[PDB]
Amino acid sequence: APVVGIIMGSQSDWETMRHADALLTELEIPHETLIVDAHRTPDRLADYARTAAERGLNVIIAGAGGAAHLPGMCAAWTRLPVLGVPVESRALKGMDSLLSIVQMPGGVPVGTLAIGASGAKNAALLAASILALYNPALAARLETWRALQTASVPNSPI
Template sequence: MAKVAIVMGSDSDLPVMSKAADFLEEIGIDYEMTIISAHREPDIFFEWAKGAEERGVKVIIAGAGKAAHLPGMCAALFPMPVIGIPMKTSDLGGVDSLYSIVQMPSGIPVATVAINGGQNAGILAAKILATSDAQLLEKLKAYTEKMKKDVVAKDTKLKKVGYKNY
């Protein structure tokens, strides 16, 4: 049963949303992924969002661009955490998406990551789930330690070969 649902309004969002899926796979969290438009197929969207809890979903990651209503509508219909990913847009660089997602009315929160922040959305979903899963928490601690070691290795290489040969 999928613990995380990844939803996007368009296949053009897939390169960003796949980063969330990649992280969830790396850490061993089951997820479902779908393309659904809150604007173009609202009846299908409502059924999907209202059925997420029954499907075992604990966190929704929703990516959207421009008007970016998908994450907020998920939060209005789904009783557990929703993480919004604002998509970079050609018109306003994603600031339009960011404002649409982050400026939710009182009582309907959407946790929001950076513009095109797919990986961070996956990490945040894992951290939410880890509050009640000790094994997952240990995996996240190991991931954090690996990031630290990677930075130390890069610094060691820089000091060894110099910036011109890096």
């Protein structure tokens, strides 16, 4: 059963959010990958978020661009930790996505990652670091992942 939910606003978000899917797949974390649009499918959003904990999700990763309300509205309906990924927008380069995600009021948090693929990748890693706290096997795979990242960095340019 999936323990992380990755959800995004539209098909065009998949270009960014696939980086999150891949990383969870790489660490062997059971997850589901869905499209949920806060503005065009608000009821779908409410249902998804309000039932998330009881279906066994531990962490939700939500990605959106523009006026990105998806992560925030999700956090409004579950006590689960929600991680937000600002998808890069065509005009304002994700600066709108960023400010509409990261600036949540006191009381309803969203842990925000970088604009773009990097944030998608880091949402996945953060969700792993969270799960790692109570799954010792995953904890080990994660330290393997980090150590390899570290050791793989070249010493000079080409």
